[PDB]
Structure 1
Amino acid sequence: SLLAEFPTCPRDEKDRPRVFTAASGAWLTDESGFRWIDFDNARGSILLGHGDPVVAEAVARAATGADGTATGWSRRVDAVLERLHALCGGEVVGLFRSGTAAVRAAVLAVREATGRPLLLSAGYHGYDPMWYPSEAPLEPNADGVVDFFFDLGLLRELLRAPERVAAVVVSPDHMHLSPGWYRELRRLCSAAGVVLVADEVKVGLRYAPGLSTAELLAPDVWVVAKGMANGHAVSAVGGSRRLLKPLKEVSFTSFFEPTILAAADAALARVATGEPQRAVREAGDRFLRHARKALDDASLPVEIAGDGTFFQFVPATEELEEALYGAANAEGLLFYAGDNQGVSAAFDEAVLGEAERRFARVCERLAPYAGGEPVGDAARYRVAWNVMDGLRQAPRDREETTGLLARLL
């Protein structure tokens, strides 16, 4: 309890952080010697696998000073910038030290460039107080942000006075929003004359070499991070020269640190091939097939949203959800509790076989829950809110919307 922060991490039944000593590909070792298969993967930022040898080699060599210095420019700066520009498009690119920092800088730049005060937001954008909730729904917070919770009806309401709106800023979820949802969001923004920022810190580079919403949203400004460096401390923003001109004022001391550049250059090279993304989808799909069959065979009322790139357990009750993760912990399957599971490209045959076996045992442990009432919508909404910080897409009217917000805020 020296730590002033509350980091999101794997925690035990007493809410104490699990202490991990080492990791390799899909596997972790804890301080008790217990061995785990990782579906958390630093919240999906470990796309390639823990201790990736090719990234590791690049990082080790950069640490010796052999690839340039934190004092100033190296050609790896140009490499990283060019790689991102090719994958994501736009006219310019900037680099940052976290997803939180990049999305804040992006949106403040757009607010400066447009001269308009309000940001309309769906999803999570990082830890900064600028994103804290307002006094009431549909009211701006103290930093001019209004949350629309992915409800396009609420967005239309807010877009009635678009002259106030610097940008719509959206964190995609491809488990809970359809392609059609995105095209409608795009349409609404375009017709309102408002800038669209795609916060792809989580989903960027993971579904494909580039932005997951490149065509669906064709955002004016993008942000990525988790996909770009196999976990290392870098994020990126890009888009029009005009909207991002205010980023000229960004400078920070560690900008040229060569280990982070080494990791991003290495990881981005593999990302560009599309191979790790395919591997993840395929491995995760294989795991899902099996897990869905095990749950059904055991009469357990747990749906799975999403797909192999990112999936989420949707249990019929809170009690079962807790039991599910307790059983998974007991069997050494480390899931990101309540949230999305994101396998890495290190999920090979060997790993998948073991994970399949362990999950069968998870389902045995849950035998007491067999035959429970099937999953209903309240559960779907609750569980989706945990991953997206807003409302999954499904038919509603305004009164149902209000009630869901009143419940879930």
Structure 2
Amino acid sequence: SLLAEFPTCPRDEKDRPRVFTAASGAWLTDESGFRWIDFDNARGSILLGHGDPVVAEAVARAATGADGTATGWSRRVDAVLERLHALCGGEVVGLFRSGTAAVRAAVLAVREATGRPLLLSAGYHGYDPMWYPSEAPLEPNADGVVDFFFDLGLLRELLRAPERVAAVVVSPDHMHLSPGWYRELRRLCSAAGVVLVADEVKVGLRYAPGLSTAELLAPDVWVVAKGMANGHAVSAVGGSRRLLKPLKEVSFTSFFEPTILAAADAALARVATGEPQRAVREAGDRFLRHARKALDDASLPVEIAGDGTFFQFVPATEELEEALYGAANAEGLLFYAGDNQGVSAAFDEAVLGEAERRFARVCERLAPYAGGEPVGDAARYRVAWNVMDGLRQAPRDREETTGLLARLLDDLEHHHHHH
């Protein structure tokens, strides 16, 4: 009861946080001694594995003072900046202490540099009150943000009068939006003459050694975080000197803290090769071939969206979704409940074999659900909203859009989110 916040974390059947006492690679141990295989991985910020030895040794050494001081500049600051700039492009780069801080700073900078008041947004951008929803949909909230819920129909309407729009700010999802969705967003922004900000806090550096939307969107400004430091407390923005000039006003006390620079430098050295990203895609795709087969062989109506990099279970009903995570928890498979699963590079052959055996047993426990009505679009929309906070791509008419927004938002009114 001391904690004033409500952090997203694995929680047990009583909604209490699970207490983990140790972690190594893919494996967590809880306070009771039970071993879990981690598909959550701090919401996909642990690309390399828990307690990765090279990152951990870099951090341990930096904690001694041997790599510099929080007092000021070290050559590792250059190393991190240079690596980011090489991977993600743009002219300048800034460093921040959370994704939330970075996206807020990025969009305010664009608002300042363009002199325009409105932000058109799709997806989650962090906990800051600036993103809190408006009273009426398609109306600006109190901080000048209009949420379009990934609907490019709605976006086209908003961009008819584009002169007040400072930027379109989008958190990509590559499970629920196709490449062509991104092409259309880009050309809607081009036609309107508006700035495009890619919030790649989650997806940046994970699909490839750069932005996931580098070619698809060629954003004017980008943000990354989860992929840059194997979980350590850093994020980054980059893009044009002109658009980001207002960032010259940013400074914070811990900027030079050397453990965080150490972890970023070490993780980004791995990220730059593209190897962990490939390892993760391959491991997760292996797990998926198996899980899809096991669900099909057991007649369970659960689809899987996405791929090895990030995948999501899409069960036909909420009661089956509940029973799925209950069963997984019983078997020590730690999924990020309802959201996307993001394996790490520590998912080696032995880990995969065990996760496959555990998943087979999950499917055995789910026997009562065999033969149920298959997955319908209503379920696909509800489950996708739980990862992207807006609408998956599918054909619909404007009235279907309105109805889905109304239903999806109403049903989340009195539930905690899991950002």
Normalising TM by the smaller chain, what interval?
over 0.9
DSSP-derived class of the 1:362 partner? helix
- State the 1:339 CA deviation: 0.1
Offset from partner CA, 1:253-283 (integer Å, 9 cap, x none): 0000000000000000000000000000000
- CA deviation vs aligned residue, 1:219-267 (integer Å, no higher than 9, x gap): 0000000000000000000000000000000000000000000000000
1:393-404 mapped onto 2 (5 Å cutoff): 393-404=393-404
Deviation at 1:4? 0.5
Task: Tell me the distance in 1 between the aligned counterparts of 2:388 and 2:107.
Answer: 19
1:185, distance to aligned residue in structure 2 (A): 0.2
Q: 1:100-147: per-residue Cα shift (whole Å, max 9, x none)?
A: 000000000000000000000000000000000000110000000000
Give CA-to-partner distance per residue, 1:159-212, whole Å, 9 cap, x none.
011100000000000000000000000001011110000000000000000000
| Residue matched to 1:118 | 118
Q: Distance in 2 between matches of 1:351 and 1:73?
A: 41
Alpha-carbon distance between aligned partners in 2 of 1:113 and 1:193, rounded to the nearest angstrom: 15
State the partner residue of 2:329.
329
Per-residue deviation at 1:93?
A: 0.1
Q: What CA deviation, in whole Å up to 9, does each residue of 1:272-307 have, x standing for no partner?
A: 000000000000000000000000000000000000
Flag structure 1 segments of 5+ consecutive residues without an equivalent: none
Q: Distance in 2 between matches of 1:296 and 1:136?
A: 42
Q: Distance in 1 between matches of 2:234 and 2:202?
A: 13
**How far does the alpha carbon of each residue in 1:340-382 deviate from its partner, in whole angstroms, 9 at most, with x for none?**
0000000000000000000000000000000100000000000
Tell me, in whole angstroms, the C-alpha distance in 2 between the residues paired with 1:140 and 1:316. Answer: 34
Distance in 2 separating the partners of 1:282 and 1:6: 34
> How many Å apart are 1:400 and its aligned residue?
0.3
Distance between the aligned counterparts of 2:181 and 2:261, measured in 1? 36
Q: Which residue of 1 aligns with 2:17?
A: 17
The separation in 2 between residues aligned to 1:320 and 1:215, in whole angstroms, is 38
How far off is 1:34 after superposition?
0.4
Answering whether residue 196 of structure 2 is matched by residue 196 of structure 1, we say yes
Q: Secondary structure at the match of 2:270?
A: helix
SS, match of residue 242 in structure 2: coil
- Matches of 1:218 and 1:251, distance apart in 2: 28
Task: Provide the C-alpha distance between the structure 1 equivalents of 2:403 and 2:32, rounded to a whole number of angstroms.
Answer: 45
> Displacement of 1:79 after TM fit?
0.2
User: SS at 1:162's partner residue?
Assistant: coil
Give distance in 2, aligned partners of 1:61 and 1:182: 43
Cross-structure match for 1:85: 85
Aligned-partner Cα distance in 1 for 2:2–2:397: 47
**Corresponding residue of 2:417:** none
CA displacement at 1:310 relative to structure 2: 0.2
Tell me, what secondary structure is at the counterpart of 1:95?
strand
* CA distances 1:315-339 after superposition (whole Å, capped 9, x unpaired): 0000000000000000000000000
Show the 5 A alignment for 1:291-370. 291-370=291-370
Asked if residue 135 in structure 1 is aligned to residue 135 in structure 2, the reply is: yes
| Cα distance between partner residues in 1 of 2:20 and 2:166 | 43
TM-score (norm 2): 0.97
Aligned residues: 409
Q: 2 CA distance for matches of 1:215 and 1:261?
A: 28
Q: Deviations over 1:24-50 (max 9, x none)?
A: 000000000000000000000000000
Distance 2:277 2:380 in 1: 27
- Runs of 5+ unmatched residues, structure 2: 410-419
Q: Secondary structure at the match of 1:242?
A: helix
What is the CA–CA distance in structure 1 between the aligned matches of 2:2 and 2:165, rounded to whole Å?
42
Distance 2:136 2:283 in 1: 43
- Superposed CA RMSD: 0.3
Q: Separation in 2 of the partners of 1:22 and 1:225?
A: 24
Whole-angstrom CA distance in 2 between matches of 1:250 and 1:160? 34
Q: Percent identity?
A: 100
Taking the aligned partners of 2:184 and 2:392, their CA distance within structure 1 comes to 15
SS of equivalent to 2:243: coil
Q: How far does residue 63 in structure 1 lie from its aligned partner after superposition? A: 0.3
User: How far apart, CA to CA, are the structure 1 residues paired with 2:235 and 2:347?
Assistant: 25
d(CA) in 1 for partners of 2:262, 2:25: 19
